[model samples]
Target: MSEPYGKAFSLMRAEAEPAWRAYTHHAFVEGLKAGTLPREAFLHYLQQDYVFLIHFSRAWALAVVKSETHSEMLAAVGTVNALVAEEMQLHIGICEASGISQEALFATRERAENLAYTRFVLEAGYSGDLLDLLAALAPCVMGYGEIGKRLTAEATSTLYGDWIDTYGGDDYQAACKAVGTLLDDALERRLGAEFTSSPRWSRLCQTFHTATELEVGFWQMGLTP
Candidate 1:
């Protein structure tokens, strides 16, 4: 499959094919696409996802510290801004419309799945390098892009239209493209054009695969709430 996100993410997703498919096409995603998802379940996901973004933003901020070049820092900082200034608004707006306050959203307890995913990404950055961090983060960022675009074309209902549009829309898609470029260039700069041949390449793929698995768990958790 052609990688809409970038070469590295393409390879990572291919290596993690089963889990990546499970994450992007999980029942929760189907629910959103079909408008059959329970309101309670979506709202639960909204709250937990709100909390998830908080940590995710921090991870991006850490990306800034780990960055080796100006362009890398710019992408990381831009992503942080997008998450905080743009994406989080979607969560807050939706939750607020549903009678859930931002305060309540902030107070949401992280599910174990949420904790596992976020901490894994954070730890990847803390202990390893920028590639390690992006390896863990790429699936969530780009998977949503893929899912959003697919759902836009395939959606059967308008029930989740707002949510769908957020990821599928031009602005978010542009961000995904930028991220893909960043990953591709970063890998080339650090690992040479034959980066995949590096011994560390497999480890990065495993991290991505594990993160994709965590995403699958996150979607399953959404159904329970």
Candidate 2:
């Protein structure tokens, strides 16, 4: 595996395990206190998120089209189709709830940070190895899933409905599932059926946690922007 992929995967896996929950929670709380996170941040995150999704959908589609394996190609195609529906229904609804128009969102240029992230993923999909593509995509998938679950548990009855909804909704769950299925497929291919002892799993968890911290910061900055 490439160093980037190896590093990111190892980080994500480490953070996802049960033992890291305490540290993750502390980091999140500190982010809130440091003014690096705000309730409305999820809206901003989602807005940029919508733009990222467009590029991500396209990248995955291109990967599928270029894939040599029929099964992998078909799976990628299905994931893209599912993501399209998720964008239209779940993401658009969230935007509408915030009094933002989907048309405006679609027409707007991506923020610099958002563009950089999307470009990274697109490049990985087009030119990087398959495992690298998986690693590149891991932050979004595993990161969001873990964060959403955490936020849902922590703020179940709080006024932060939008943030919670974005992460905990059925649509988000479906998206996570799709990503996870893809991860599982990749793992099986690379490690074989009984390869359960890799250190990469732990690293993947930590990287995901780090990404969520960044997401929380993005929301904090956007609240004032």
Candidate 3:
């Protein structure tokens, strides 16, 4: 399940299985696959996710500043572009079909869960180095990529197929591969080939695990509305 992303992401995901399973197989996601999710709840998630992307785009932009190499900067900027041009537009378009204007989506109020996750990511970038921020960032991107692929293959209904396709499709999967490469490269460059044995390795693992837990929280939050 974790092999395709890269060595670092696969290892991190394997170690974080409990939280990762809770997140990827969350009730909210199950509901989506079965087309049983309440429309209100889905719409609510879209609204909150729109805002989440806004802040998340900024965090990726921060990676651009934190980048020590041109390749890193390019990957970071491409992520920002994907957020603004593709992912956020998915939210807006889906919401628009439900009569939610682009303006309304942009004006969505931040929920507590949303606030905590976004700020945690931004702070990870601000307080730590590139690896720190990426550790925190990996779950959302890679997790969704995984989810989209699973839901595409496993979904029993087509009600949420577009959402499923967005992440599962080639473009987003390509983005995930790019991110995995960037992350593995970053870790090796900073901590050497034996990055797992580095003094900061445990902290990085914790950062990744914490972010996965936060993702569980985010999915739980989606189920409530």
For each candidate, how many residue pairs have backbone atoms clashing (under 3 Å)? Answer: 0, 23, 1
lDDT per residue (tens digit) for residues 1-225 in model 2: 122223334445554555334434545434433435554665665677777788878867766755556666776787688778665467778788877786888886677666766676667667744545665566665555556666666663455555556666777766666666666676667656543566554444443454444444434444544
Give the top-scoring candidate (lDDT): 1
lDDT of each: 0.93, 0.59, 0.90
Q: Tell me the lDDT of model 1 at 89.
A: 81
Q: In model 1, which range of ten residues has the least summed lDDT?
A: 1-10
For candidate 3, the per-residue lDDT at 46 reads 87
At residue 11, candidate 2 shows an lDDT of 43
**Candidate 3 per-residue C-alpha lDDT over 101-129 given as tens digits, one digit per residue, 9 for 90 to 100:** 87777678899999999999999999999
Which parts of model 1 are misplaced by more than 4 Å? Answer: none
Q: Give the best candidate by TM-score.
A: 1
**What TM-score, computed on C-alpha atoms, does each candidate reach?**
0.98, 0.67, 0.97
lDDT of 2: 0.59
Worst 10 residues of 2 by lDDT: 1-10
